[PDB]
Design a protein around this ligand. Structure first.
Ligand SMILES: CN1C[C@@H](F)Cn2nc3c(c2C1=O)CN(C(=O)Nc1ccc(F)c(Br)c1)CC3
Ligand SMILES: CN1C[C@@H](F)Cn2nc3c(c2C1=O)CN(C(=O)Nc1ccc(F)c(Br)c1)CC3
Ligand SMILES: CN1C[C@@H](F)Cn2nc3c(c2C1=O)CN(C(=O)Nc1ccc(F)c(Br)c1)CC3
Ligand SMILES: CN1C[C@@H](F)Cn2nc3c(c2C1=O)CN(C(=O)Nc1ccc(F)c(Br)c1)CC3
Ligand SMILES: CN1C[C@@H](F)Cn2nc3c(c2C1=O)CN(C(=O)Nc1ccc(F)c(Br)c1)CC3
Ligand SMILES: CN1C[C@@H](F)Cn2nc3c(c2C1=O)CN(C(=O)Nc1ccc(F)c(Br)c1)CC3
Ligand SMILES: [Cl-]
Ligand SMILES: [Cl-]
Ligand SMILES: [Cl-]
Ligand SMILES: [Cl-]
Ligand SMILES: [Cl-]
Ligand SMILES: [Cl-]
Ligand SMILES: [Cl-]
Ligand SMILES: [Cl-]
Ligand SMILES: [Cl-]
Ligand SMILES: [Cl-]
Ligand SMILES: [Cl-]
Ligand SMILES: [Cl-]
Lengths: 134, 137, 143, 128, 134, 133
C-alpha cells in the first residue's frame, strides 16, 4: 500500500507540522473564513495558480465532505471529526494559507522558531514570541 | 428581486466586513457621535462631497427611521431590543465604521487593516503578537 | 434669549468638547491648581495677555461664585441629609461644564489651539474603539 | 511679623513644591540616607559649598529636633510633608540643577493630575 | 575508575551547566522532538557531521536505554527517580548540544553565565527581560 | 581596638553598601555559586590576581567558618540572615560585581539604584538602572 505525505511536495513533513502544539492553530471555521477572505477569487479560478492553491482547494472540499457526512448523521458524530480529524486539517489549512501569504521558506523558519520558543520554560522564555513577516 | 451589496460600489463586500468580529465595532451611539464630530459640516452640506458622504448620510437617516419605528412601538404599545441588537445593530455598526474610516484613512488602507486584524484576532493567544495591527496613513 | 457658545470665539464648540468622556477631564481642583502653577502671574496681571487669559479668569471666578453659593447653602440649609444631594448637583452637572472649559483654556495656552483640537478628536476616536482593537497607548498632547 | 519663604531665595515657592502630591515624595528617612550617601562629606565640611548645602544642613538638624519632640501622627504627616518637600527639593537641585528640577516638577504635576484613562504610561523623568 | 566530563571536550564543565537552575531546561520530550525536528537527517546520517552530532546521537540513545529500563520496571515488576535525577542530567546535555549546534559554543556559554546571574538577582533589581540567544 | 572598613581600600564604605536595601542582594548561596562559576580557577590560583580576589578568597572561607557554627532555632536563623547574612551578601556582591564591571560602574550603579528604589511607585521610572561595561 502507499504512504503519501501531503507536505513532502511542499518541502515539509507531517512530523514537522506536528512540532507546533495543537493549541497553536486557529479553528477550522476561522481558517476557512480566512481562505475565503484572502484567496476566494483564486481558489474559485479556472487557472491552477499554484500547487498550494490546488492543495488548498482539495483540503477545503475534503473538510466539507467530512462535515457533510457528520452533519447528516443527526452530536456524538460531530465530536469525532472535530477531535480526531480536526487537528489534521487545522495544520494543513494553516500551512497552505500561510505559505501563500508569506512564502514557504519564511513559514518553515517561523515554525521551528515558535516550536523552540513555546518549549522554553516560562522563567527563561522571551516575552515576545517570534512573528511571521516578509 | 434585487441583490444590492452596500459595499460593492466601494470595493468591498458584506462577507468582507463580516470577517471582523462583532465585538470589534464601536457602538452605534459612538459612531454617530464621531460622524458628527468629524464631518457634521459636510454631512449637512448641499454638496455631494463624495460617494462615502452620500452613503453615510442615508445610513444615519435610516438608523433614525429604524429607531423611530421601534420606539413608537414601545412608547405606544423588550424582545424588540434583543432583535435590534442581534440583527440590525451589527449591520449598521459595520456600515458606519466602514464609511467613517474610509473617509479618514482611505479605502485601500482600511481594507488591508481589516484583513490583518481579522487574521490577528483569529490567532490563538499563545501565538498572536501582543499588539494588534493599527490603522494609519 | 441669546445663544452664546464659550468655545465659538476660540474655534471649537460645546458639542466638540463633549466628544471627550466625563472621566477624561481632571478635577476642578487639579485644574485650578494647574492654572495657578502655570499662569498665576498673568492671570492676576493688569494686562489682557490673550483672549484665553480673559476667558480663563472669568471661569475661575465663576467657579468661585458657584462654590460660595454651595458653601452658603450647606451652612444655611437645615435639611441635613439633603446637603449630600445638593452638593452632588454641582459635581455632577456644573462641575463637568467647568472641567471641560478649564481644561480647554489651560491646554490651549500651553500647546496651541490646533494641537489641542487634533488631540481631542484622536482621543475621542481611540477611547471609543473596543478594548480588543484599540492600541495600548492613547494619543498624547505635545508640541 | 515676617513671612519668610524657604524656597524663595532658591527661585521657587511653597505653593510650587505643594504642586507635587503627598505620595510623590520619598520618606524622610530615605531622603536623609540619600543626603548622607551623596553629600555627607560636603554637608559635614567647614566650607560653605553652596546655599543649597547651607540650607540642607539646617533642615536635617531641624528635623532631628522635631523628632525628639514627638518622641500626633497626623501632625507628623503635616510637618513631615514640609520637610519631605524641602529635603527633596535641595537634594534634587544639587544633583540636577534648579531649572531641571522645576520643569520636572510642573511636568509631573500636570501628568499625575491626568486621569488614568488619558495619561501616558511613562511619567516625566529627571535627567542631566 | 576514570573521571570523564561529557562537556570537557566541548569546552565546558558539569559545574557550569549546573549553574542553570533546574526549571530552566525544557522537558526531555520537548528536547528530543526538537533534535528530530532540527537535525534528524544529520543525526541519522552515516557521516560524522560534527563532534556535537556524535555526542547528541549517543545521548538520545542513552535516554532510550534509561527509559526502557525504568519502563520495564512497571511492565515486568522508580520511574519517578529516573524522571528527577537522570532526567536533569539529560535535560542539560540535550539542551547544551542542541543549542551549541544551533548557536555556537561561545554564544551558548556567554548566554549561560548571563542568565545564571540574571535569574539569581532578586526580582526588585533584575531587568524585566532576561538574556536571549543569538 | 581597631576600626577596619573592608570596603575602604576598595574605594567604598559600609554605609554606602548599606544604602542598597536588604532585599536587593542575591542569596549567600547564589553568590558563592556565581563566584565559583565565574572565578573558580582564579580563586584557587597560587597567584594573587587582584586585591578583589584576595578579599573574596577570605570572605568565602569566613562564611564557611560562620556557617559551621550556626548549624551547630528560628531565632538563631533570623539573627544570622539579618546581621551576618546581609554583611556577606553585600561583601560577596560588591567584590564579584567589581571584578565583572569595574569599581566605578559598580558605585555609580549603586547610587542610581539606591535613589531609584527610594522613589515612590507613583513617580519612579519603570526600568531600573542596570550594570554595564
Ligand atoms: C525563539 N527564540 C529565539 C532565540 F533567538 C532567542 N531565544 N533565546 C532563548 C530562547 C529563545 C527563543 O525562543 C529560548 N531559550 C532556550 O533555551 N530555548 C531552547 C534551546 C534549546 C532547545 F533544545 C530547546 Br527545546 C529550547 C532561552 C534562550
Ligand atoms: C497580523 N499578523 C501579521 C504578521 F506580520 C505577524 N504575525 N505573525 C504571526 C501572526 C501574525 C499576525 O497577527 C498570527 N499567527 C498566525 O499563525 N496567524 C494565522 C495564520 C494563518 C491563518 F490562516 C490564520 Br486564521 C491565522 C502567529 C504568527
Ligand atoms: C488614535 N488612533 C490612531 C490611529 F491612527 C491608530 N488606530 N488604529 C485603529 C485605532 C486607532 C486609534 O485609536 C482604533 N480603531 C478603530 O477602528 N477606531 C475607530 C474607527 C472609526 C470610528 F468611526 C470609530 Br468611533 C473608531 C482600531 C484601529
Ligand atoms: C506629562 N505629559 C506630557 C505631554 F507632553 C504629553 N501628554 N499628553 C497628554 C498628557 C500628557 C502629559 O501628562 C496628559 N493629558 C492631559 O490632558 N493633561 C492635562 C492637561 C491640561 C490640564 F490642565 C491638566 Br490638570 C492635565 C492627556 C494628554
Ligand atoms: C543579566 N544582567 C545583565 C547585566 F549586565 C545588567 N544587570 N545589572 C544588574 C543585573 C544585571 C543582569 O542580571 C542584576 N543585578 C545584580 O546585581 N546581579 C548580580 C550581580 C552579581 C552577582 F554576584 C549576582 Br549572583 C547577581 C542588578 C543590576
Ligand atoms: C534612577 N533614576 C534616574 C533619573 F535620572 C531619572 N529619574 N527621574 C526621577 C527619578 C529617577 C531615577 O530614579 C526618581 N524620582 C525622584 O524624585 N527620585 C528621588 C529624587 C531625590 C531624592 F532625594 C530621592 Br531619595 C529620590 C522621580 C523622578
Ligand atoms: Cl478575494
Ligand atoms: Cl507573544
Ligand atoms: Cl465639522
Ligand atoms: Cl492591542
Ligand atoms: Cl506664574
Ligand atoms: Cl494610555
Ligand atoms: Cl560624600
Ligand atoms: Cl511611571
Ligand atoms: Cl531534518
Ligand atoms: Cl523574560
Ligand atoms: Cl573558572
Ligand atoms: Cl525593573
Amino acid at each position: 500500500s502507499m504512504d503519501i505525505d501531503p507536505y513532502k511536495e511542499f518541502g515539509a513533513t507531517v512530523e514537522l507540522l506536528s512540532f507546533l502544539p495543537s493549541d497553536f492553530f486557529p479553528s477550522v471555521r476561522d481558517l476557512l473564513d480566512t481562505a475565503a477572505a484572502l484567496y476566494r477569487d483564486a481558489l474559485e479560478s479556472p487557472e491552477h495558480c499554484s500547487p498550494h492553491h490546488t492543495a488548498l482547494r482539495q483540503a477545503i472540499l475534503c473538510w466539507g465532505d467530512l462535515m457533510t457526512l457528520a452533519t447528516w448523521v443527526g452530536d456524538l458524530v460531530v465530536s469525532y471529526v472535530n477531535t480526531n480529524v480536526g487537528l489534521k486539517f487545522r495544520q494543513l489549512l494553516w500551512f497552505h494559507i500561510s505559505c501563500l501569504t508569506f512564502g514557504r521558506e519564511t513559514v518553515l523558519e517561523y515554525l521551528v522558531s515558535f516550536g523552540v520558543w513555546i518549549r522554553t520554560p516560562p522563567a527563561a522564555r522571551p516575552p515576545n514570541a517570534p512573528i511571521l513577516s516578509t
